[PDB]
Amino acid sequence: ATVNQLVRKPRARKVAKSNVPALEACPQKRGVCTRVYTTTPKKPNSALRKVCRVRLTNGFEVTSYIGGEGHNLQEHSVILIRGGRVKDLPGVRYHTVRGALDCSGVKDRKQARSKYGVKRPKA
Amino acid sequence: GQKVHPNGIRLGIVKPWNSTWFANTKEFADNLDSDFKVRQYLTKELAKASVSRIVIERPAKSIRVTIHTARPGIVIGKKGEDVEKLRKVVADIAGVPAQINIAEVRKPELDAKLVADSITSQLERRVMFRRAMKRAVQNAMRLGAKGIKVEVSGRLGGAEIARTEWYREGRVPLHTLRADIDYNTSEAHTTYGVIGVKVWIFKGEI
RNA sequence: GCGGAUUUAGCUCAGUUGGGAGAGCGCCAGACUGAAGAUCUGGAGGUCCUGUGUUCGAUCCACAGAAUUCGCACC
RNA sequence: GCGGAUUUAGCUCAGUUGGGAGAGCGCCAGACUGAAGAUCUGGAGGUCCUGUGUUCGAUCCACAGAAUUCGCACC
RNA sequence: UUUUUUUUUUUUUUUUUUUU
RNA sequence: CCGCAGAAGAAGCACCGGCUAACUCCGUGCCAGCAGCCGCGGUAAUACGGAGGGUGCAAGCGUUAAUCGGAAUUACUGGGCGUAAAGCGCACGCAGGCGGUUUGUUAAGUCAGAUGUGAAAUCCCCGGGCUCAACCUGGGAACUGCAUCUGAUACUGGCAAGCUUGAGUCUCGUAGAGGGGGGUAGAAUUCCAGGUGUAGCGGUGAAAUGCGUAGAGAUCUGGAGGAAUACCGGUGGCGAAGGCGGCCCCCUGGACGAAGACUGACGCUCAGGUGCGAAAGCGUGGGGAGCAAACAGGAUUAGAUACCCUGGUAGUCCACGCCGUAAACGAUGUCGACUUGGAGGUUGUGCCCUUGAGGCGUGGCUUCCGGAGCUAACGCGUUAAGUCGACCGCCUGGGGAGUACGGCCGCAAGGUUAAAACUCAAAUGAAUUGACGGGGGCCCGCACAAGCGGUGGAGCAUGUGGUUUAAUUCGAUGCAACGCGAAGAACCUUACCUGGUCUUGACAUCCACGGAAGUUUUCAGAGAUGAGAAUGUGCCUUCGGGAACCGUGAGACAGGUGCUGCAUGGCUGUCGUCAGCUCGUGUUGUGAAAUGUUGGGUUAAGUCCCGCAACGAGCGCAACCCUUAUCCUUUGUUGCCAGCGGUCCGGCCGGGAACUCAAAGGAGACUGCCAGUGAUAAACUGGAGGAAGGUGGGGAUGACGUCAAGUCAUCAUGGCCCUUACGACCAGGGCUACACACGUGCUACAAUGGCGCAUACAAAGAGAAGCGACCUCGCGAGAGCAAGCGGACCUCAUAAAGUGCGUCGUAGUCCGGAUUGGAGUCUGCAACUCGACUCCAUGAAGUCGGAAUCGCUAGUAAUCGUGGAUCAGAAUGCCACGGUG
């Protein structure tokens, strides 16, 4: 009831705190794959997830999550960028709808329908 | 927060027995054993007009069975052929004769029990018995009583639902060993789980 | 048409062209403890991305195929 | 190399005729606390560096040896 | 309107669904 | 459009929480993951992720980039100023806003009209053409303003005229803690020149560093310095705030009580600025008491880096001046009209035979606190928030901030605009908590008292830790846990280490074909179970069907303390012997406030007189109880003996009913009457009278409220267990070590003791899976004989103290059973590396232990014993009543 302590976390369970800095135009964008990483020891033992950096002109350096299945998301590519920074990721402030170019994304996952854009199976 | 029998604690004071018999030292065990079985059989015969009081006397181990039901004329039979039958199957377990005496439930509306057998019948229709539950209590209360409280616990909704509801069509002095009060029960199912109704019928003061 | 490096315990990666391996994090556990931590101890985790042949003996080699990737032959 | 301190309680360190092993502190008990410290009263805590000799008796001293360590010698 | 008899005591996890 | 030919050729995605909307069967473990406000997932995930069905809707379905929705917000049209945010300590005047209100007049704005603009697709209405939805459209209108003119006059502004006198200057009076310079009245007390009394003065939760035969102050007399306002002083006076305390001389603030005179709005109220400016720095030179931050230590030390206490400056104040400035809040300006008011606190004053405490008046300064309204809950109730208004304002939501990046000012520090990168999720206020609380206060309990007995150090009976052993079984870790559950962890109700059988198993059914049920050894086997040899043949009796009672073969089909208190009911607890709460209605509180606890008093007491808007409804109440204890009748009981009858000396056996006893029905003690107490209330004391006394004692019931505590190991059962299993048969064994403790429980340290011989009295108990005397053999554990005895008959106590006479002589013994030499036993498959007790040899610590864990207030702990169950059985556990005390 002492509001300066109380306001931080109190009874909501979506808890609205999200930190999403930087602007300079709009959030829905194209993002160059610049330079790949898979470095950094953390608590979530993140496996095979190549989380790379993007050359966004925004006043500081930034990074993006791999946004969906399909292992090849190479360093020469340029995908779409959007919000959705799961609790799992430090530093990053976006994810990616990544089956543009040659990077493919969903392979034969019949269930994916309107969520990614796949065609029908054997009826 | 307590359930509290007015009945049983006070047998001599307006609330007579379910059984009054006498076995000595060694002879108690098979009497008592049979006192569940003849009771079992009788209630499944009677259920077409229930059984308010199910009175097992034993004048000499052999059994003066005294049965309050709303409609005697269906256990009498077409006159005498079920009175033969019952007297056979209630003596058989005991090994000794059982003198099947009837009585009529003097208007079911006023009774020590039949208020619970009306409400638990409705759960066999499987539709929304709530339309008929407060009603069937308030009807029986125009034909007798001064207060009643009624409790239903059970599976009364759908899929995973178990909850419990409480209702008061008059005041209830909860234990009073001088008053005309009755506590009682009855038990239903609805293809999901139990529906067990209980009553406290504050009929009168003394 | 080039052919080279990195891929190691669940992660990170030390280091390794033949005797087939290594640390912390994380994981589980014998207790203390309702469960953990203070105090006090225990177990691992893989034949180093893998498969045919070498070879007395493979992560290693010859050799093909996978993942991270590289600039040039590409027009 | 010569001279010197030094290997004396977890911690800082006192100590020696040459025969006891010490204290602030730390632990533990006694209780005061549900508990613990303080503060308390009792118990306990030693590679006395090793060897040798003097000697009643060496932690000590002298001698020889290890090993740290300090100044000066070196220009 | 003099009000220091010692200062400290880790996170949890309690929490009987739901529209009325 | 009209015949053939066929339902033919035409549909699906979100998904399914909850928002409009339909839910489950399952998965992977804050994995992977949607991420809009919410919500989901932290091995039981209703939409994450799979799947079954179905749903919203159907060329559609979710969702996305922005932004207003709902939501009231930049408000001439639309507003909140106790709140978010919110009248900025302060107003010298320069422009600006409102300029007093009506006559005669005027229509530029005001308003209505006539006429022009807005050809055509609007917005808003109808009529229609296509088959028609649409589409294609035509017709009907409405357009604030601006133009050009006709009018109608109530405002807006003016014009001529006048006033209401807003505004001042004179005239005339009257006092205070004075805006700035002047004059300056008076206690203490330092420390000295010398006048003295000798050792003690300050200071504290306890005192300290100076000091004292080179005399601790103080106290006179003689002197040298520093310069508060102590009060006629206030139950008060002034002032723009601030802010001065004595009174006075000058400059003479403001005022403001008045005969009036003279001019007629010269006016109010203000931003940028003008002055003023509490805290503080800059000063520049000092005025340099007493106290007290820093200064300087003595001291209280878990570090004080401290607070004391002597010593200590700055603050005291300020000539003079950049001073912004924050707590100077009707959480609030400018104010005129407001005329139910009525009550005080004060000031000046009109009128009274001033016979007078002020009577009749009446403004100002101030507070009190009053209807209609306004209205949450406190109540505010007209000058106050309800009407009516002139603005100089502030008011742009989190978090960005009091912040900078141009320069206006400032002596530099800063003042002051209060902008903005970007970011992101609600709360400030009430009012309600009560945290277990060395509050004020009421208390009270071994809390604490006064005190009694002790536990301790060394040795002993022993369960974890921890040694690490070959290898280790749960859960035990303050008040909610101790001797585990186990009251017998070596057949034992089996953990567990195993091995030997099984998974309808040991136990128990409904039909199918059949059987008479059992006694006795021999050899195998660790037990379960294996291989043989003999002896037997039941009751109805339809000779049918079967019983007692044993079989093999069918289909159905068997089980276990597995914890959650959290579906719930019993039950038990320490709180509780408080006189309980909350309610059927009511209603002040929207609701968590209890709403009888309030307002006077009265008792140790929610005691009892009343009152108060409070009833009363019944479950606690009112008390039924058990044992007393003293007796009353009927009694006499194995009991049990008054008074005599025999004595062969034992209530023995005659012999009768006093009382214990045994005891059923039951019964009697009340302020009863006496003195003191005060209100002849209260009740508290002693006592008549008593077997208790003011519940007489001891048991007992143990209401709501009971820790989110249990009985989760019989509970009673809802949600959920493992089932090749947590199901059931059977022989072994090993829990105890030992360094460590630490205690619970045991004792040994000698005379208020015991030791040796001899003497006086009770009983509490349990008792045919029973308990057993006399009496035989005895060093005795322990053998035998057996009367008896079912509930005073049999027996197990012949409590220990105490008392009379002897012996040690303070002495490690004569006492210590720690224990170890040998000897034996009651059972048993069983005790030995495993006990439990007995006979004789002996003799480990022994000599009065500190600290600091609570026993125990009364007939109660030292002191003084005997019994019981579990169970083929050895607890020191605990459990209950007697008695020197």
CATH no., domain A1-123: 2.40.50.140
Of B4, B8, B15, which Cα lies nearest the Cα of B173? B4
User: A66: burial class by Cβ within 10 Å (0-12, 13-18, 19+)?
Assistant: buried
Cα separation, B107 vs B186, in Å, equals: 18
Residue B40 belongs to some domain of the structure: yes
The residues near A120 (Cβ < 8 Å, ≥ 6 apart) are none
Instruction: Strand F: list positions under 7 Å from protein Cβ.
Output: 13-15, 23-25, 30-41, 49-51, 61-62, 64-66, 422-429, 431-433, 567-570, 584, 617-620, 704-705, 718-719
Structure tokens at B184: 């009682």
Task: Give the DSSP letter string of chain B.
Answer: -----SSSTTTTTT---SEE----TTTTHHHHHHHHHHHHHHHHHHTTS--SEEEEEEEESEEEEEEEES-GGGTSTTTSHHHHHHHHHHHHHHTS----EEEE-S-GGG-SSHHHHHHHHGGGS-S-THHHHHHHHHHHHHSS-S--EEEEEE--SSTT--EEEEEESS----S-TTS--EEEEEEEE-SSSEEEEEEEE-----
Residue B112 sits in the same domain as residue B22: no
Q: Is the CB of B1 under 7 A from strand E?
A: no
Which of B58, B79, B106 is the endpoint of a domain?
Answer: B106
Q: Which nucleotide is nearest to A20 (CA to C1')?
A: F423
Instruction: Say whether both B152 and B141 belong to one domain.
Output: yes
Q: Does residue B113 share a domain with residue B206?
A: yes
Residue B202 belongs to a domain = yes
Range of the structural domain that residue B195 is part of: 107-206
**Backbone dihedral region of B126: left (phi > 0), alpha (psi from -120 to 50 degrees) or beta?**
left
Distance of CA B42 to CAs B2, B54, B97, Å?
32, 8, 15
Shortest-distance nucleotide from B171 CA to C1': F584
Measured on CA atoms in the order B181, B38, B191, B69, is the torsion positive or negative?
Answer: negative
CA atoms of B180 and B172, how far apart (whole Å): 11
From B66, B88, B106, give the residue that closes a domain: B106
For the CA of B195 and the C1' of F321, the distance in angstroms is 95
Same domain assignment for residues B198 and B135: yes
Q: Tell me phi and psi for residue B92, to 5 degrees.
A: -65, -50
Nucleotides of C under 7 A from a protein CB: 10-13, 24-26, 67-71
Q: B144 with B98, same domain?
A: no
**Method by which the coordinates were obtained:** cryo-EM
B55 shares its domain with B141: no
Distance A34 CA to C46 C1' (A): 34
Q: Is-contact B195 B120, C-beta < 8 A?
A: yes
B91 residue type, one letter:
A
Last residue of a domain, one of B106, B121, B146: B106
Find the Å distance, CA of residue B132 to C1' of nucleotide C34: 49
Q: Check whether residue B60 and residue B140 sit in a common domain.
A: no
Closest nt by CA–C1' to B164:
F567
How far out from the chain centre does Cα B13 lie? 19
Nearest Cα residue to A93 out of A50, A35, A40, A54: A54
Alpha carbon distance A96, A80 (integer Å): 6
Q: B135 and B98: one domain?
A: no
Q: Quick check: B81 CB within 7 A of strand E?
A: no
Residues B200 and B128 in one domain: yes
Instruction: Provide the residue ranges of all domains of chain A, joining segments of one domain with +.
Output: 1-123
Point out the nucleotide closest to A39 (alpha carbon to C1′).
C12
Domain count, chain B: 2
Identify whether B11 is part of a domain: no
Residues B93 and B129 grouped into a single domain? no
